[PDB]
């Protein structure tokens, strides 16, 4: 406890660059896994239509799979337009 | 005395040869057929023996790819 403080005290002394280095790497290394919208983009790059969407050959076995565009059923994007 | 104190009877080593000459025989038909069939599988490739590697077939990815000609 008191070793610990004395050598971060005395590193924050004749060696602050080293410092603010550390604490900024290390808190690079940390906050991605705690922070909530690390799956917001995860969401957003998976939702950024590269490719075709090729149809499906339809046999009256798919209740959740559009027909049209504008059909309720299917990925929607109205999160993304909240953010 | 010399017979019945130190040794034993012709029969014994007589069936005793009969035995390893079986054995022997039997060796050498196996070593010949063994190599005859080591000859075809290494020429023919149909045998357990000789299989070399060929590409797995589930890393084929089957998709659509973009392109409607694959
Ligand atoms: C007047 C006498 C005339 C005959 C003289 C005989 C001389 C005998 C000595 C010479 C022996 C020749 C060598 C034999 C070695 C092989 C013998 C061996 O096969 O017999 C084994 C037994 O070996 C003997 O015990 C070896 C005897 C060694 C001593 C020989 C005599 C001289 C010894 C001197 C010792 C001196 C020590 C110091 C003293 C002061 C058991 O055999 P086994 O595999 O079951 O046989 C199966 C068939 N059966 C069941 C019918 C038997
Ligand atoms: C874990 C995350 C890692 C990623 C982030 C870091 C990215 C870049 C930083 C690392 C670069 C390499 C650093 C190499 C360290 C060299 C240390 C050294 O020996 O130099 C000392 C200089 O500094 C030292 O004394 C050695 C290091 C002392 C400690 C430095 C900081 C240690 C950690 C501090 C922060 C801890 C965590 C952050 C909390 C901050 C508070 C909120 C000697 O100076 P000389 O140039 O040789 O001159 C000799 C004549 N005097």
Redesign the pocket.
Request: glycine share 12%; hydrophobic share 70%; proline share 0%.
């Given at each position: 406890a008191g070793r610990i403080a004395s050598?971060?005290k005395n590193?924050?002394a004749?060696?602050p660059v080293?410092?603010?280095?550390?604490?900024?790497?290390?808190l690079?290394?940390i906050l991605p896994s705690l922070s909530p919208y690390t799956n917001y983009a995860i969401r957003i790059n998976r939702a950024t239509p590269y490719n075709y969407p090729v149809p499906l050959r339809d046999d009256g076995n798919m209740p959740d799979v559009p027909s049209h565009p504008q059909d309720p059923q299917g990925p929607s994007l109205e999160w993304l337009k909240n953010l | 005395w010399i017979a019945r104190t130190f040794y034993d009877g012709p029969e014994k080593n007589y069936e005793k040869t009969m035995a390893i000459l079986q054995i022997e025989a039997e060796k050498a038909e196996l070593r010949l057929k063994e190599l005859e069939v080591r000859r075809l599988m290494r020429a023919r490739g149909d045998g357990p023996w000789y299989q070399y590697p060929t590409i797995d077939k589930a890393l084929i990815d089957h998709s659509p790819k973009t392109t409607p000609d694959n």
């Open positions: 050598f971060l590193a924050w004749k060696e080293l410092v603010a280095s550390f604490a900024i790497g290390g690079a290394i | -």
